[PDB]
Amino acid sequence: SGFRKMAFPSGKVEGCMVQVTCGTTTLNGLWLDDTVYCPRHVICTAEDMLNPNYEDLLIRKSNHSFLVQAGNVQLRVIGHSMQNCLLRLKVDTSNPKTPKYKFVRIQPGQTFSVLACYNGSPSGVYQCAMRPNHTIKGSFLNGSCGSVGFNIDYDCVSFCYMHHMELPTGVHAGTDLEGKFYGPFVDRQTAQAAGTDTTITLNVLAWLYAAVINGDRWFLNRFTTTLNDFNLVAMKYNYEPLTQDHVDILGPLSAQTGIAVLDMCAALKELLQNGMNGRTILGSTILEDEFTPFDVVRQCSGVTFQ
């Protein structure tokens, strides 16, 4: 019993983390086969930040200028190119710890695990969700750029995030593994700020299902509601509008429990309007929104990874 937010075991990704250094600038890189991926702003120095001409700064870069280190091992760089906001460094050695993997671009609301890294050294791992406003509420300090977010499915690592920068509210933005930012941000120290954010309704609902599967069900009721009627209350409380697509994604959980999604929405409606009245749900006093429907299945079903 018990419900924790959990990250994926991080070993498969740990073996891929390296240190990349251009002059005074060091940050993290991801080494898969014979390629190291890293934020392109590694070719900067403390001024080139305001507005770099990446295409042009990269021109004056030599292979020997990139210092790539894996543990106590310097990797000889034999190629380099840019792909959107990432650098792609070719090295003379294929990573022997390279896992089965793929690059995916996750959707807002979806979760992944982040391996926080510094100087090529993994420091910590935690679970987070891509917020509706295309940021993540992470924990990052100087030198953490290049750290990656990922999911694991069976024995396959899906990399979905690489860290680039911290916005003024202390939330974080980055790219997928093709170098394309999530949200409207760009990799320069210009004035940018995250847009207003909303609660991930789909995940709250999922979590509510998890509560029921775990025997926590005092909140259920005998009523239902229309989708539109739910969204009218939901949006007053700054919840993402719920869509029919979301309803279908809750399909398996609704089947397992025999509670129709709209029936659960009425329970959530009542919860928002009346509060909890001192009671708790899966031990919490708030409505958790960083567990996805899939997270719930995987956990309550005891899924493991090879």
Binding site: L27, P39, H41, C44, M49, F140, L141, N142, G143, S144, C145, H163, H164, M165, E166, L167, P168, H172, A173, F185, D187, R188, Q189, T190, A191, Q192
Partner: peptide, 4 residues
């Protein structure tokens, strides 16, 4: 923004 602060590159990190």
């Amino acid at each position: 923004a602060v590159l990190x």
